[PDB]
């Protein structure tokens, strides 16, 4: 415990000293240059990678790393790491080609920068796939320092990717860049998954006592290229269809979990429940901003109320699905010490399909808020784009975390 | 527990719907007017007050409110509520006189606004003094709704006070206003104390099983008027003396707790430890912003390094004092199941004096960052002033929370 605090304050101080540098570039833009946020990030990343090799080769293979058979983080948290990691590779690959085939500008600073991120992701997703379930017993003092070095590295990468001035508006430059970067950012989503995996490992250090993997990263490159197919195939009726797909999918979902919560009344792990509540920003903060943004517009179009009906319906699906999960999760833990079970079984099976239908349209779909333009006229586009890059990766992470709890109550009902 | 979640999601949704309104005024400033942040706040406040009377008269006086004798929040958390509450009254009293004795402008919207805040504070500090230690058993469903209504009311008051455009720069208008509002804001500090008192009560609802008070609010009005005496008595040598007082007080404090942490090595409640870590922003976020802000200035004055030495010394007093508290707090909890004790006793006695010396200079002292002007030239003054109103009330709350733990280890050492 004493080594945990001696690692904790080093872990707390480092991200504050890191997050100061990457923010002060954005607050001033004139005195401090753009290279010091990046140079510091690269140096921090290099040392985090060589620890991961040192933990892999010379530490884990020795005797004294106790396996955690029981829960230790499940398959989807490993799988969504594997999917969202390799899409961040291609997004850096498509970036680094643009830097080469470019007008006469700065050379080799960003090119040496993005190449290290290709190294840093690739060695980290290997580590977290292997060391997801380990409980280290041999060298406590270096591993507790080694994790918080990597944990502080990701949060700065999350903070650097949020505050990004996309100053928008040549036969090969335009088609490679303009229809491309209007996507769901993947390196942000990769940063949250490595954040929520390193913390469970850091909590569980010093605790007393291949044909099914190659299909994930193979088909994801077709799914990542499917995202580019949507933006390169471009309306007031197409976006009306784009808002129709999210409306028609979640329509029965509000009617589903409402009856499901009532059956838990007629019938009568600790880190999981907070991860459901931090995700409230992705479905309440981004929506209430838009509901106000349709009300105080003057003309009241026939699709402004379509935008208002979308964001209001997003709130009700949140508050129905959340209470269904926790009332089910209490209904399993108490069973340590009927046809209503058929109601719970038929309900969780329906929710798992629509959440996946929401997730693929969420991540590998259109970025629907640059197409929106209503609140982009109301709020400033330089600061409204920051609110998208906080909530939209949180909302997608809300789905992949919720599906795994729904699979647990489905399996518990059928057995 | 089920009524707790049914109160929790109502409590979570309300502050997001509230915090959306008060922020969207600040992001646009043109479509939404200034009155709707305020009108909504006033309506929310009125309903929170009449619950507090209803809990006071008709609920607590009935049988079935179990006293918590043991800890339940101690005297200083009640006392700092009593001090910082009544200074918020005079700050609203001095505001409402300026609104009357004023140029021809808007009438009676702000005047009806600030009068309700005089009501809302005064009925709340009566309630939290009385109901600090109660564990309600009679009407669970209304009290869990009643607390989260008041808890969401304070956080919007914390958020409204942060985002405030002080567009600075008549024989009775100037001396009443200009030397006055450059103070440590008290209504922000009042909001945090009511936040950390309502949450312990909300956690402890439904748990199974006057001559020493009049001196606080009496002498605080002399101390609040002592704050106005400093700004109305006004240099490059005076601010050099102002930075000298903070330097000379915390100088031995870094040398104190360093030797104190070593004696805990030579010798060999759960909500308290997180409140020590949220307070890191008040002593690390505001300092690292300034250390960069002295480095990238060109001329390197003979007092720029004085400003750099101040903020660097603030970090080392944080990391010395924090590990001393937790290593002492573990050293008391383990004693359920020597002259080194004289080292701990002489150390905690010295720290309690300098923290109080830091606190009075912290709260009832000069606001040293409007006098600073260095980073006000580097960062924008419209957004640097927001960072002061996050960290400076957190840093003052860090002191009053730390003193009470130091009094506990001092009493435990002497007995």
From Swiss-Prot, chains A, B:
Protein name according to UniProt: Proton channel OTOP3
Extracellular-side positions: 26-35, 97-108, 293-303, 365-383
Purpose of the protein: Proton-selective channel gated by extracellular protons.
Superkingdom assignment: Eukaryota
Phenotype upon changing residue 398 to A/Q: Reduces proton channel activity
GO molecular function: identical protein binding; proton channel activity
Protein localization: Cell membrane
Activity regulation field: pH regulates the proton channel activity from both sides of the plasma membrane. Low pH activates the channel from the extracellular side but inactivates the channel on the intracellular side. Zn(2+) and Ca(2+) can partially block the channel.
Subunit (UniProt): Homodimer.
Cytoplasmic side of membrane: 59-74, 133-140, 407-413
Record-annotated membrane-spanning stretches: 5-25, 36-58, 75-96, 109-132, 141-163, 186-202, 271-292, 304-326, 347-364, 384-406
Sorted UniProt keywords: Cell membrane, Hydrogen ion transport, Ion channel, Ion transport, Membrane, Transmembrane, Transmembrane helix, Transport
Topology of the protein relative to the lipid bilayer: Multi-pass membrane protein
Gene Ontology CC terms: plasma membrane
Catalytic activity of the protein: H(+)(in) = H(+)(out)
Single GO biological process annotation from the record: proton transmembrane transport
Residues of the full protein shown: 109 to 681 of 681
Species annotation: Xenopus tropicalis (Western clawed frog)
Protein family according to the UniProt entry: Belongs to the otopetrin family.
Disulphide bond pairs: none
């Amino acid at each position: 415990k004493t080594g945990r605090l001696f690692s904790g304050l080093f872990g707390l101080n480092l991200m504050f000293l890191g997050g100061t540098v990457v923010s002060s570039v954005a607050l001033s833009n004139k005195a401090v240059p753009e290279r010091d946020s990046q140079s510091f990030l690269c140096i921090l990343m290099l040392l985090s990678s060589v620890w991961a090799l040192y933990h892999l080769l010379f530490i884990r293979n020795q005797n004294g790393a106790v396996h955690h058979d029981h829960h230790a983080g499940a398959m989807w948290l490993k799988a969504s790491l594997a999917i969202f990691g390799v899409c961040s590779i291609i997004l850096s690959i498509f970036e680094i080609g643009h830097a080469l085939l470019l007008q006469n500008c700065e050379i080799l600073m960003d090119i040496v920068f993005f190449s290290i991120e290709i190294v840093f992701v690739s060695v980290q997703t290997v580590l977290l796939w292997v060391s997801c379930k380990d409980c280290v017993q041999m060298h406590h003092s270096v591993t507790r320092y080694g994790i918080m070095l990597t944990l502080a590295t990701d949060i700065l990468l999350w903070l650097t990717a949020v505050i990004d001035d996309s100053l928008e508006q040549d036969s090969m430059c335009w088609g490679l860049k303009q229809g491309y970067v209007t996507m769901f950012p993947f390196n942000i989503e990769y940063s949250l998954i490595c954040a929520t995996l390193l913390f469970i490992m850091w909590k569980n250090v010093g605790r007393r006592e291949x044909x099914x993997x190659x299909x994930x990263x193979x088909x994801x490159x077709x799914x990542x290229x499917x995202x580019x197919x949507x933006x390169x195939x471009x309306x007031x009726x197409x976006x009306x269809x784009x808002x129709x797909x999210x409306x028609x999918x979640x329509x029965x979902x509000x009617x589903x979990x409402x009856x499901x919560x009532x059956x838990x009344x007629x019938x009568x792990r600790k880190l999981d429940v907070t991860l459901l509540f931090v995700s409230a920003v992705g479905q309440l903060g981004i929506s209430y901003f838009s509901i106000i943004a349709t009300v105080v517009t003057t003309p009241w179009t026939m699709l402004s109320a379509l935008n208002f009906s979308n964001s209001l319906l997003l709130i009700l699906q949140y508050l129905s699905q959340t209470m269904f999960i926790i009332e089910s999760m209490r209904s399993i833990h108490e069973e340590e010490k009927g046809l209503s079970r058929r109601v719970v079984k038929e309900m969780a099976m329906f929710l798992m399909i629509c959440n996946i239908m929401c997730w693929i349209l969420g991540a590998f779909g259109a970025h629907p808020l640059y197409m929106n333009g209503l609140e982009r006229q109301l709020y400033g586009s330089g600061i409204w784009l920051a609110i998208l890059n906080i909530g939209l990766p949180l909302s997608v992470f809300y789905r992949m975390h919720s599906v795994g709890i729904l699979l647990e109550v489905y399996l518990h009902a059928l057995e």
